[PDB]
Amino acid sequence: MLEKVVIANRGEIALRILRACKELGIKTVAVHSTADRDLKHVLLADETICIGPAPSAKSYLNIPAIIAAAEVTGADAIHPGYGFLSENADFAEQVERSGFTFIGPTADVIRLMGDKVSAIKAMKKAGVPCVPGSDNDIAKNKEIAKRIGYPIIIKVVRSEDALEEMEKYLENPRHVEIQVLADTHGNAVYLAERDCSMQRRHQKVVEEAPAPGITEEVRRDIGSRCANACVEIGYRGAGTFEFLYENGEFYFIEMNTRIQVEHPVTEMITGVDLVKEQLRIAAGLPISFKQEDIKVKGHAMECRINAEDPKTFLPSPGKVNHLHSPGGLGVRWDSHVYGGYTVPPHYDSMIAKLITYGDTREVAIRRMQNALSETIIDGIKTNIPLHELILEDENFQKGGTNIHYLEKKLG
Amino acid sequence: MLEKVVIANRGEIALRILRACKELGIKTVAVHSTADRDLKHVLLADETICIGPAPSAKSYLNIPAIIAAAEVTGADAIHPGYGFLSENADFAEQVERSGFTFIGPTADVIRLMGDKVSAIKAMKKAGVPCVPGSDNDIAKNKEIAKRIGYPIIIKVVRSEDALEEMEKYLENPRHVEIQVLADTHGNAVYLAERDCSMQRRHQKVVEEAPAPGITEEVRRDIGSRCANACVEIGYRGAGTFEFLYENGEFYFIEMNTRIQVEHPVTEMITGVDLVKEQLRIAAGLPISFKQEDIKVKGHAMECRINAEDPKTFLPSPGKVNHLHSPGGLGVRWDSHVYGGYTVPPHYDSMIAKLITYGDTREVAIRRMQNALSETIIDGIKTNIPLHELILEDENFQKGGTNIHYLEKKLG
């Protein structure tokens, strides 16, 4: 089975992956750019290989160099984390053709769900609810616009005298997404859902689980459709079905065929280790539990702590002169940052994920607020003040705010 | 109810208490010595009051100064943490006589269980199993020694020709202790048990929960005896019944009428917040759950990280130039220490409690091992190397090692 894994990523997720590997007794190979020699996980890894200069294009997206790292170290498998090459089918193809195990889905499946149109077709076939849509003549597309109902969106049109160069545009939906696992033994489970509606420019800021308002009955319906879809398309590994959720109905928008940034909130409420399940599934093992073993308990929240100006959102690279990370009951800290570490300019601005858990949503929120106040990151700016503004927002406290709320609120 | 609490303690437990207070919206008053002005919880507290110079005798054991802090701030209650004045009945008496709520048991009960002899009498009456014992004439005490069976121990005698100036001496018992809560509504629950057998000079080093080998059936018997004992003696608050456990039988040795250092392992396996329950019980509320709501899930471990030489055990006070604390799934960090903090000489050597949780004992242990390797405390010596030696000990990994094992092993 898996004895040595190349961690084809960086920052917090690479550390997350390294931790799962070490727990399972799996040797680690940290591939890194010249700028990431000081990454925590690189310093912790069993073997390190520099795969290029600082720019992503030349390092973490360098398909030949990463595969060569797998070859010279005699690794068995490659974990792509999220972002970078994790949903690149050519990379997954290349990895399997070179005789290594890609920790994720098969290339064919990545490519199927890598194209918005062919994804939606596969989902509709599978019985997963989709945005009503078109499924270049004037009267025709005026007819389909009319059937679907304005406003629509060519890929936003609000009237038919402006139909120009579809599917239903939902004005005020939430972002509710379903976590799944599928294995090579024909099993597929759903691990409740996450609400990630607090976004700026479609980039998530705060996530939570479960999603407020979602009953178990609704959870089992939309969840089982997602599990069956996994089986129909021959899915393998961890994945997320993302939906727009409005007036009680779900509408598919994307499957992330990979682990997601916000996976920890789901871990907290179900007791599942999603990265370990990834590794076990990749090695050929079945999912370590059955659907009936999964019971949502309590509530969890995640704040993405970024090195950026909290109003301006301009990155804030630099040396962290002092880090103090929070702790105590119900507080989890996923971060590669350490006192004296320099946050580089070349990649994303995420420096930590602060995750809280409580027996209720109210407790998870208060716990997040107290954890944030204890947190100190000196030397650079962070978005902690933004998190604090969100958490004390009366509408957020009520719950169920839609995907446009944050931008609206910041005005 | 409780609106303002004086935290009559320091270091990690004072921070633990402050966190629980803040979650409940309770104002905090940090009483501190002149040496503890820089304690994390002091820096976080709503109000601070210096109660004396560095020596404990003059500050944290200064009964009049602590009560005066409660008075001038208009506090409602005083939480004594563990150690210091937490099991001092005169202090509890004084606190209640001055009109403040003591967060713990009544004075009369503290004093009852504050005397080994009267404690054992109350336990025997209650139906809690005790060490067979005497319950100054020669032939008499030779007779009782004979009844009890050598070896015995005057408070160690192995033969009767050496009977000189009792109870059964257990050669190789484990330390297994039962967590309880009792409230002012007549309820008392038990929260499974902890094994704290890894000790040096009777000072605990590693704790775990549940205790290996203990069946649920055995748990319910010894647990329910402990709960009933609570009711019989009119117990209030959190408390622990400590037992020596050998060849399948429990023998009472002490009740700690207070919160315990190692409470977090129990929190991890039951989902209970023990410090919050303390505060709620003190305010007059019932325990927030029933016995039937408590189900042991998974396994947890705690390592007491001390500023001391790992072989020599001599304290190692000094400036922490760099702290890096571990995290990730199943890792909890309870500590007041921060980068740049100076560990003083005047108090205990504990600087952090590293707590791990997993679905099994094996996972909790591996998780602890990985967390310890990530942990960096530069500028002073710690006992981390000792923890690492314990965790990789084949006997510890099997589980069930007795209270003498650690000292034996270190030879």
DSSP string, A44-76: H-SEEEEEESSSGGGTTT-HHHHHHHHHHHT-S
Say if the Cβ atoms of B339 and A331 lie within 8 Å.
no
Q: Which pair of structure tokens corresponds to residue B364? A: 């909790």
Distance from CA of A339 to the nearest CA of B (A): 7
Distance from CA of B374 to the nearest CA of A (A): 8
CA quadruple A67, A70, A71, A76: dihedral, nearest 10 = -120
Q: Give yes or no for a contact between B148 and B158, defined as CB atoms under 8 angstroms apart.
A: no
Compute how many other C-beta atoms are within 10 angstroms of the C-beta atom of residue B276. 20
Q: Are strands A174-182 and A237-246 parallel, antiparallel or unpaired?
A: antiparallel
B39 three-state secondary structure: coil
Q: How far apart are CA B60 and CA B42, in angstroms?
A: 14
Q: Which pair of structure tokens corresponds to residue B289? A: 């759950």
Q: How far apart are CA A310 and CA A389, in angstroms?
A: 10
Cβ neighbours of residue B172 closer than 8 Å, sequence gap 6 or more: B246, B402, B403, B404
Nearest to residue B6, comparing CAs of B116, B98, B127, B122? B98
**Best of B23, B262, B295 to disrupt the A interface by mutation (most A CBs within 10 Å)?**
B23
Q: Which residues of A66-78 are buried (b: 16+ CB within 10 A; e: fewer)?
A: bbebbeebebbbb
Q: What is the CATH number of domain A1-85?
A: 3.40.50.20
CA atoms within a 13 Å half-sphere pointing along the CA-CB vector of B153? 9
CATH architecture for residues B86-130+170-411: 2-Layer Sandwich (3.30)
Q: Give yes or no for a contact between A130 and A147, defined as CB atoms under 8 angstroms apart.
A: no
Say if the Cβ atoms of B327 and A325 lie within 8 Å.
yes
**Best of B15, B18, B19, B46 to disrupt the A interface by mutation (most A CBs within 10 Å)?**
B19
Chain A, nearest residue to B271 by Cα: A359
B109 three-state secondary structure: helix
A310 three-state secondary structure: coil
Write out the E strands in B151-298: 174-182, 188-200, 203-209, 237-246, 249-256
CA B30 distance to own-chain centroid: 21
Q: How far apart are CA B319 and CA B302, in angstroms?
A: 24
A283 three-state secondary structure: coil
Q: How far apart are CA A242 and CA A288, in angstroms?
A: 24
B218 is in an annotated binding site: no
Write out the E strands in A210-248: 237-246
Q: Which DSSP state fits A254?
A: E
Q: How far apart are CA A359 and CA A292, in angstroms?
A: 21
Nearest to residue B323, comparing CAs of A340, A356, A330, A333? A340
Q: How far apart are CA A204 and CA A176, in angstroms?
A: 12
Q: In one letter, which amino acid is A52?
A: G
- CA of A201: how far to CAs of A33, A211, A241, A403, B364, in Å? 28, 21, 20, 10, 40
Q: Are strands B27-33 and B47-52 parallel, antiparallel or unpaired?
A: parallel
Helix (H) or strand (E) holding A126: helix A116-126
Q: Which pair of structure tokens corresponds to residue A158? A: 């609000």
Say if the Cβ atoms of A331 and B332 lie within 8 Å.
yes
Say if the Cβ atoms of B19 and A329 lie within 8 Å.
yes
Compute how many other C-beta atoms are within 10 angstroms of the C-beta atom of residue B36. 24
Cβ neighbours of residue A382 closer than 8 Å, sequence gap 6 or more: A305, A306, A307, A308, A310, A316, A351
Q: How far apart are CA B229 and CA B235, in angstroms?
A: 8
**Best of A15, A325, A329 to disrupt the B interface by mutation (most B CBs within 10 Å)?**
A329
Compute how many other C-beta atoms are within 10 angstroms of the C-beta atom of residue A195. 26
Q: How far apart are CA B146 and CA B140, in angstroms?
A: 10
A23, A328, A335 ranked by CB distance to B327: nearest: A335
For residue A376, the chain B residues in CB contact (below 8 A) are 338
Cβ neighbours of residue B398 closer than 8 Å, sequence gap 6 or more: none
Q: How far apart are CA B238 and CA B242, in angstroms?
A: 13
Burial class (CB in 10 A: 0-12, 13-18, 19+), A171: exposed
Q: Which pair of structure tokens corresponds to residue A153? A: 């969106």
A16, A19, A323 ranked by CB distance to B370: nearest: A19
Burial class (CB in 10 A: 0-12, 13-18, 19+), A225: buried
Could you tell me where the DSSP H helices lie in A243-360? Answer: 263-270, 274-282
CA atoms within a 13 Å half-sphere pointing along the CA-CB vector of B67? 18
Q: How far apart are CA A319 and CA A242, in angstroms?
A: 36
- Name residue, tokens 């949502």: A296
Write out the E strands in A135-221: 174-182, 188-200, 203-209
Distance from CA of A23 to the nearest CA of B (A): 6
Q: How far apart are CA B258 and CA B263, in angstroms?
A: 10
Resolution in A: 2.0
Residue B258 annotated among the catalytic residues of the structure: yes
A333, A339, A370 ranked by CB distance to B19: nearest: A370
Phi/psi of residue A367, each to 5°? -65, -40
Residue A21 touches partner B, C-beta closer than 8 Å: no
Residue B359 touches partner A, C-beta closer than 8 Å: yes
Q: What angle do CA A262, A264, A267 make, to 5 degrees?
A: 135
Q: Give yes or no for a contact between B207 and B196, defined as CB atoms under 8 angstroms apart.
A: yes
Residues in chain B: 411
Chain A, nearest residue to B44 by Cα: A374
Q: Are strands A331-334 and B203-209 parallel, antiparallel or unpaired?
A: unpaired
Q: How far apart are CA B263 and CA B274, in angstroms?
A: 7
Q: Give yes or no for a contact between B85 and B218, defined as CB atoms under 8 angstroms apart.
A: no
Compute how many other C-beta atoms are within 10 angstroms of the C-beta atom of residue B160. 13
- Name residue, tokens 């996450």: A194
A175 is in an annotated binding site: yes
Q: Which pair of structure tokens corresponds to residue B373? A: 């390797």
B116 is in an annotated binding site: yes
- CA of B274: how far to CAs of A186, A329, B281, in Å? 43, 10, 10
Nearest to residue A291, comparing CAs of A373, A212, A407, A192? A192
Residue A319 touches partner B, C-beta closer than 8 Å: no
Q: Which pair of structure tokens corresponds to residue A51? A: 């795969």
Residue B116 touches partner A, C-beta closer than 8 Å: no
Gaps after residue numbers in chain A (C–N over 2.5 angstroms): 135, 155, 165
Compute how many other C-beta atoms are within 10 angstroms of the C-beta atom of residue B397. 14
Q: Which pair of structure tokens corresponds to residue B212? A: 């290996």
| Rama region for A29: left / alpha / beta (φ>0; ψ in -120 to 50; rest) | beta
Residue A324 touches partner B, C-beta closer than 8 Å: yes
Q: Which residues of A252-274 are buried (b: 16+ CB within 10 A; e: fewer)?
A: bbbbbbbbbbbbbbbbbbbbbbb
Q: Give yes or no for a contact between B41 and B336, defined as CB atoms under 8 angstroms apart.
A: yes
Q: Which DSSP state fits A25?
A: T
Method: X-ray
Q: Give yes or no for a contact between A193 and A176, defined as CB atoms under 8 angstroms apart.
A: yes
Q: Which pair of structure tokens corresponds to residue B306? A: 């001390």
Nearest to residue A170, comparing CAs of A252, A240, A254, A245? A245
Say if the Cβ atoms of B23 and A334 lie within 8 Å.
no
Q: Give yes or no for a contact between A182 and A285, defined as CB atoms under 8 angstroms apart.
A: no
